[PDB]
Amino acid sequence: EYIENWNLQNRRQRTGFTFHKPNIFPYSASFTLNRSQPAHDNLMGTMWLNAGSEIQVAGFDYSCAINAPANIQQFEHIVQLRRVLTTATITLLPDAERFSFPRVINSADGATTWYFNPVILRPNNVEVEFLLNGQIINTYQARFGTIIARNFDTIRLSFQLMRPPNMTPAVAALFPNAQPFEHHATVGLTLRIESAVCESVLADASKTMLANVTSVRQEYAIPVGPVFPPGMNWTDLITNYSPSREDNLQRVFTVASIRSMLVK
Amino acid sequence: MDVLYSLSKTLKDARDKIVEGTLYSNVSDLIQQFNQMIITMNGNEFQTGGIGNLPIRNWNFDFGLLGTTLLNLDANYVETARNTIDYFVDFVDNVCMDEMVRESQRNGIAPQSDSLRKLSGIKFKRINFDNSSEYIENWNLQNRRQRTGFTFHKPNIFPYSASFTLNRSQPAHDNLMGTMWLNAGSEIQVAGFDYSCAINAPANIQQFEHIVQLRRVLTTATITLLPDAERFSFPRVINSADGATTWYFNPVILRPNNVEVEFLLNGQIINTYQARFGTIIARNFDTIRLSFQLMRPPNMTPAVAALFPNAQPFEHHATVGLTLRIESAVCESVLADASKTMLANVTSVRQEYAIPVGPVFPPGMNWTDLITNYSPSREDNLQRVFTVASIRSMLVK
Amino acid sequence: LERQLGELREEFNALSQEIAMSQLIDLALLPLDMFSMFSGIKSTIDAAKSMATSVMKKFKKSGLANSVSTLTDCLSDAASSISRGASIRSVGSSASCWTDVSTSISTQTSTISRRLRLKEMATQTEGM
Amino acid sequence: QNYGINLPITGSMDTAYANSTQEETFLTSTLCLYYPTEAATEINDNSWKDTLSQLFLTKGWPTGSVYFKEYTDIASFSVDPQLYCDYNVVLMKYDATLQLDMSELADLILNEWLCNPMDITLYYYQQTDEANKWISMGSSCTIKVCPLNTQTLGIGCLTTDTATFEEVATAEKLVITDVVDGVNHKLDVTTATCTIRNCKKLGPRENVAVIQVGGSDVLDITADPTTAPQTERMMRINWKKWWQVFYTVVDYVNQIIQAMSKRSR
Amino acid sequence: QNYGINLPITGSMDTAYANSTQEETFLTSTLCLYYPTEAATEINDNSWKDTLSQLFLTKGWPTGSVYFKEYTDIASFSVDPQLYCDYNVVLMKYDATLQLDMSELADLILNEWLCNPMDITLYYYQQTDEANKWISMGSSCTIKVCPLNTQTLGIGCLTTDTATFEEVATAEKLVITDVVDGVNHKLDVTTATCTIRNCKKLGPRENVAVIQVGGSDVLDITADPTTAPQTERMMRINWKKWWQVFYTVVDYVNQIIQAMSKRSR
Amino acid sequence: INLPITGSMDTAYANSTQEETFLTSTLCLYYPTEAATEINDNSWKDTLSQLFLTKGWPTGSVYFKEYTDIASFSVDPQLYCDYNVVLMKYDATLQLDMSELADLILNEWLCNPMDITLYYYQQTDEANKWISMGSSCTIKVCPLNTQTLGIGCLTTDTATFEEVATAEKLVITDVVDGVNHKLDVTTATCTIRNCKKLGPRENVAVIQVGGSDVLDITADPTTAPQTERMMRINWKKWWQVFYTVVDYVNQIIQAMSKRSRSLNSAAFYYRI
Ligand SMILES: *[C@@H]1O[C@H](CO)[C@@H](O)[C@H](O)[C@H]1NC(C)=O
Ligand SMILES: *[C@@H]1O[C@H](CO)[C@@H](O)[C@H](O)[C@H]1NC(C)=O
Ligand SMILES: *[C@@H]1O[C@H](CO)[C@@H](O)[C@H](O)[C@H]1NC(C)=O
Ligand SMILES: [Ca+2]
Ligand SMILES: [Ca+2]
Ligand SMILES: [Ca+2]
Ligand SMILES: [Ca+2]
Ligand SMILES: [Ca+2]
Ligand SMILES: [Ca+2]
Ligand SMILES: [Ca+2]
Ligand SMILES: [Ca+2]
Ligand SMILES: [Ca+2]
């Protein structure tokens, strides 16, 4: 496949590398607060962990949408990939896991901390839009499970947190009309790119070319190069997927596959 | 279909092997085969498209054979080969795109995209080179009926179902006993919850059982079974059955006792597992029965005894969970996976060329609604379109 | 009026089958205005009141009229600010007001057809 | 339309939340306040009930749905209560010297009891679990109990000499007695004035709501001393007048009806 | 430095916890105590302030960062409390007869109220939400209310005969009134010796800290009778002297200031 | 419960719930003062209990509740037991009273209160009736016309009203369902309630000790049914009656069944 796509690129044509669970997202765990205070006691925001082939996003409101209009709060996350993808097979699920238990997180400036005690609800008005050049391509509303995306450079996940209008006592005692708010309503979404195809070269959970490269470099103690970062940290090497880096990466991956065909 | 596979395979092997400087002793056979195919094609005029945004293209084949005088290759040979191969490749791609989109309930195995009905003739039979892939091998076996098999890694056989069942319910939803389950793709996360920690139950024990019934048999399945299901192990606000009101769910995870996992086949038991966690096997099964129990700890420390009182409030609900992931599997029929792109190719083609909904596939080809009803006609059409999608992927991924 | 109304229910449930089909289809293509409906009373019994007003002062308190007003106000507020459209949680690709699900496919379709009950008396029809 | 059967129910999670059943449950239900005579005394008015009803009318509760039922005293109310409405609210005055009395009243009304009768003169009774208690109502109950041994002899008491018994209640209007579970007791009771019944505590009653108008929350519903819990329908206010209390109840009635839910039985 | 606006903030999860701002916040901030006259009375010392200052100096708080501000009584303190410091502490004695006033004081100082004025002679006022209350300060406030109907007529009261109005306060120095939200009220008030202000309770003030000295925790800040919460800056102690209390405060002043947080507004 | 139930005809008849329902249920007899008087004994209750103890019913399950008279018993009957047996003496002059008693206890009523003075009520169906209890009830009724005026009676002159009950302790009244009545009742001495008749109460068992079976529960004079739990003995004494009851208690409990609707101590449900 690698030498074939090499010969294709030399004889310019539409290539393709079939990836299973591609590590295309750089490790990014981070939050965004749209209503904040110094004491961090009534917050509204969204938290996302984009790691390897998966994303886990979650929108949290400490007031459970009591002051908002129509008892609803909107959350949106726009992931803008570095390279295009096609025939992506994706698994979308609700109630993201790692943002679903008690937590003690530092603020932006790392000066003070704040507590986070979530209560998971379902995301309503959920809309997943796979876009390419800003033109929407694929749209899904309330469809969970195994889905497909045919061509996309951007993903937009837009969901809502809706206060249940009818509530039993045990859950009404958790969402009072006062500021303390010791239970914070949350709505989560997990999204894993199980398989896909790409006109460029990446890393996966199936192939060892990247590991052979990095092992060679760690073994023979190569100085930092002008192009690749030190140690070839895939995070800082996918963050800036420039054409020089892409070419050198295709090249080293190809020769690494070639070597792996002989010595394992 | 065999001729389509042979076309794609010989064209792939041609674009791979036919390169400058190489030795004719390595591609003499493939060149004789290419010339034979050219002879079998020359004199025919095919058509492709006309459903949706697919353009209506007419293919005429008038080419010249490749000489066998040479003993080494050169650019004035490779370039001729390429200018002859590109046309066949575009033809095969358009054929596969005109075939992935058509359906029929009456003998769906029988090919649509009538150009392919023609290529299935007896004079076109001289093109079969090797039916070496898994899909074409199983196709041939089915045509000559025999025990087939498709091997899968993390197959998507479970339709997305996320639902509960309460065997003791109340309007105020304050003392409940029930089971929640999420069955999605290759994973089953089940959890039996009791709000009273089995205080009024006999022997301080509460049973829980989850029966799953697969729509297609599986064999040689490798399974990863662990306790303490994760997605039902945090606070939650869930709706009622009729959806009017909501109730709260604050879980506290314990360990399953008297656990028993039974993989059954036609109601008879095949494999049984008592308290074995980790990597296990299941050799033949259309049904799964996960039966566990919640046993009240007879000896309890103060901090935990202060959570399960003898009275109704019950502000912590004892749960017992189980995750079960089918890592590998083998199936007589065709499914989807986390490794292959056939379904992605099909659905993408259909979304791109705006194919209307047909009498067989659901709208957008959603795997949930397409696995929930896996009737023989749907299975046949699915096998057909997956096979030709694999054929197309062998060349254009 | 419970016993009289039950007697009239019985009269309807015994005349219903005595009604004909051909002449009923012939009558269902008639713009039977107020006068056409209230002039042909059996005997115009005794110098009756304005029957249009008499029926309307009960008509505009009921489920039908209140649902009309609700459809009105839920298109109005939705067109005014984006909270109601965004809240009604349609299936997707638009929510003006109509695609609303108060309460799977069966459920959505029934909930939508109980709103399509107003398409008849909204002039959004073409047929019978 | 099956009755008396407990069947497994089933649902889903992709179902959407339905509409607000408030402003219709009010019209199709009934509400009953239980205020003390001191409230009406301090108020010194005779149109306050109609005033509160016209106020409630602004919250949604119609005129002929709300009711005010007076009770002279906590103990008089405790003497044979009959709470029969679709939503009951009770305004309870705090009194240190009535702490156990208004704890037994709370444990009696907040919960739902399955009661059988008792014939002291004939049988010797015993408790099976921590829920089969003995509740005695009347004008003045004076109860004494003798536990018996394997051979139906007394333990530190004489089956004949009534005076050797262990008096557990002295001239009380409502008693809720929990004794050692697993032994046969013999009782002396002033049956002319008080009736006692063997009652097993079932799950809670969600139809009534107690509101301690004064001091700190002391009510210990659970007879066992370890838990001492506090539920949603056990509220507290601080008071210097009663008009303010009734205005507050009215303004936060929807919170009360959210904390409460109609009866299962 | 975009004031008057609110923008999305952002960050990450890889940054490490920075150094301890303690031993600097004490120096660049100020601490004001509010003790009762009974404390200095029992003490009978003139240098106890310099003593507590030299003690704070060991914990880190410098000499001229500490302030003491006496108050003869809880009601005299409730009369226009002007808390202007960077960390306020308030030692509060318990009295079962003053419970409502010392709970109104808590609901007034613990929170941050947005207060608009009020003129009773001209207008008739109504509430919109459950946090838009009417707070009356002065030496002796006697407040009476008459709700009105849709057509501007009273309900159990007459718009001329002030005697028929409903009384909620009687010679109180501080009052906090909540009424039915959706109805216009006509008011009678002793405007000469009391000022009433229509205030909306915003988010809380994290700058003060109430420390009850005596009885159990009873303060129901939230006017609605469902929460009855216990905030983090609502402390309790049991006392027999005052020197022990001040030593406790000084020894645990860091936990106090961790429970408090510099204001936002 | 609105859900369905499912079963199968291949299953096996399980063991007898008898000899365990006796242990986890309670029984309660209602005998007249005449019976204790004829008996002239003080330990006959403990005797009967020791006799039940052979039939399986344990010591602390059987109860006896004396009632001075049928009418005093019909006045607010509070039946709170898992199984109730009633011994009822026949009397022609009390036929209608002991038929109203039967209609009250054998059936399960859903009652609302009735304010005579401010409002006027009507009956809708043949199961919505007006039951009045107390020491001396006297009920007069005037049905009204479409324009809220009397029919053969005057809305003011209470003597013009039509008297349906005189000097009765319990009265069950069924009037023309669909007209508005104005009532005159001794509210000070008798409270009246609009009660709908739900399905039957399988917890009680009436035993007519003397005369033939005459009780016509169903107010319509077209059924005159004889339910399973409506029994008859012929008597010349009371000891033989009690021995018969004790020796054939199993058949009685086989003819009865625990309630289905809910738990309640009185003879009816209240819904305001
Ligand atoms: C649902 O509740 C909202 C808020 O009370 C109301 O505006 C809306 O009309 C309700 N829906 C219907 C169908 O009445
Ligand atoms: C923070 O604390 C560490 C350890 O006490 C110290 O080494 C460091 O210098 C401190 N930071 C600054 C800015 O002084
Ligand atoms: C039911 O009765 C049969 C026949 O006497 C007996 O064999 C069986 O053990 C009984 N069932 C039980 C659970 O004892
Ligand atoms: Ca008592
Ligand atoms: Ca006990
Ligand atoms: Ca003794
Ligand atoms: Ca005050
Ligand atoms: Ca208010
Ligand atoms: Ca007045
Ligand atoms: Ca009678
Ligand atoms: Ca007359
Ligand atoms: Ca009738």
UniProtKB/Swiss-Prot annotation, chain B:
Species for this entry: Rotavirus A (strain RVA/Monkey/United States/RRV/1975/G3P5B[3]) (RV-A)
Role this protein plays: Intermediate capsid protein that self assembles to form an icosahedral capsid with a T=13 symmetry, which consists of 230 trimers of VP6, with channels at each of its five-fold vertices. This capsid constitutes the middle concentric layer of the viral mature particle. The innermost VP2 capsid and the intermediate VP6 capsid remain intact following cell entry to protect the dsRNA from degradation and to prevent unfavorable antiviral responses in the host cell during all the replication cycle of the virus.
Calcium listed as a keyword: yes
Positions of region (Interaction with the inner capsid protein VP2): 62-73
Residues reported to bind Zn(2+): 153
Binding site for Ca(2+): 266, 286
Gene3D superfamilies noted in UniProt: 2.60.120.170, Viral capsid alpha domain
Keywords recorded for this protein, A-Z: Calcium, Capsid protein, Intermediate capsid protein, Metal-binding, Ubl conjugation, Virion, Zinc
Official protein name in the record: Intermediate capsid protein VP6
Keyword Calcium: yes
Quaternary structure annotation from Swiss-Prot or TrEMBL: Homotrimer. Interacts with the inner capsid protein VP2. Interacts with the outer capsid glycoprotein VP7. Interacts with the outer capsid protein VP5*.
Tree of life domain: Viruses
Post-translational modifications: The N-terminus is blocked.
GO terms under cellular component: T=13 icosahedral viral capsid; viral envelope; viral intermediate capsid
Family to which the UniProt record says this protein belongs: Belongs to the rotavirus VP6 family.
One Pfam family from the record: Rota_Capsid_VP6
Subcellular location: Virion
GO BP terms, alphabetized: fusion of virus membrane with host plasma membrane
HAMAP family: Rota_VP6, Rota_VP6_A
Molecular-function GO term, any one: structural molecule activity
Note: The VP6 trimer contains a zinc ion located at the center of the molecule. The zinc ion is not essential for either trimerization or transcription activity of the DLP. Zinc-depleted VP6 has an increased sensitivity to proteases.
Curated annotation (Swiss-Prot), chains D, E:
Chief localisation class: virion
Disulfide bond positions: 32-85, 115-199, 141-194, 146-157
Keyword line: Calcium, Capsid protein, Disulfide bond, Glycoprotein, Host endoplasmic reticulum, Host-virus interaction, Metal-binding, Outer capsid protein, Signal, T=13 icosahedral capsid protein, Virion
Keyword Flavoprotein appears in the UniProt entry: no
Ranges for region CNP motif: 115-117
Domain of life where this protein originates: Viruses
PTM entry text: N-glycosylated.
GO molecular function: metal ion binding
Record localization: Virion; Host endoplasmic reticulum lumen
Binding site for Ca(2+) 2: 127, 178-179, 181, 251
One GO term (biological process): receptor-mediated virion attachment to host cell
Record region (LVD motif): 187-189
Cellular component terms per the entry's GO annotation: host cell endoplasmic reticulum lumen; T=13 icosahedral viral capsid; viral outer capsid
Presence of the UniProt keyword Glycoprotein in the record: yes
Positions that bind Ca(2+) 1: 45, 156, 164, 166
Glycan-modified residues: 19
Subunit structure: Homotrimer; disulfide-linked. 2 Ca(2+) ions bound at each subunit interface in the trimer hold the trimer together. Interacts with the intermediate capsid protein VP6. Interacts with the outer capsid protein VP5*. Interacts with host integrin heterodimer ITGAV/ITGB3.
Annotated family: Belongs to the rotavirus VP7 family.
Role played: Calcium-binding protein that interacts with rotavirus cell receptors once the initial attachment by VP4 has been achieved. Rotavirus attachment and entry into the host cell probably involves multiple sequential contacts between the outer capsid proteins VP4 and VP7, and the cell receptors. Following entry into the host cell, low intracellular or intravesicular Ca(2+) concentration probably causes the calcium-stabilized VP7 trimers to dissociate from the virion. This step is probably necessary for the membrane-disrupting entry step and the release of VP4, which is locked onto the virion by VP7.
Additional note from the record: Some rotavirus strains are neuraminidase-sensitive and require sialic acid to attach to the cell surface. Some rotavirus strains are integrin-dependent. Some rotavirus strains depend on ganglioside for their entry into the host cell. Hsp70 also seems to be involved in the entry of some strains. In group A rotaviruses, VP7 defines the G serotype.
Protein name: Outer capsid glycoprotein VP7
Organism annotation: Rotavirus A (strain RVA/Monkey/United States/RRV/1975/G3P5B[3]) (RV-A)
Phylogenetic classification of the source organism: Viruses, Riboviria, Orthornavirae, Duplornaviricota, Resentoviricetes
Whole sequence portion shown: 51 to 315 of 326
